[PDB]
């Protein structure tokens, strides 16, 4: 496992969950069994570390 960076465009891979973007802070309370997040267009929006 690599280091954690924020506000930097990075290739990221969270247990197979790929994607490249900038990681910020959010307040969207996830459920304990909920792991990933999507939106209306099925776009990965919020992710739990």
């Amino acid at each position: 496992s690599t280091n954690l960076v924020k506000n930097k465009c990075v290739n990221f891979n969270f247990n197979g969950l790929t994607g490249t973007g900038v990681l910020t802070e959010s307040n969207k309370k996830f459920l304990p069994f909920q792991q990933f997040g999507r939106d209306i267009a099925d776009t990965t929006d919020a992710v739990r570390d």
Partner: peptide
């Protein structure tokens, strides 16, 4: 009333479907 009626805004901008802002702003 119109603006509060009509409501997606950025959910279709994350896949390369960039939306050019209007040359003329809303105001």
């Amino acid at each position: 009333l119109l603006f509060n009626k009509v409501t997606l805004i950025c959910a279709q901008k994350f896949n390369g479907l960039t939306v050019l802002p209007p040359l003329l702003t809303d105001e």
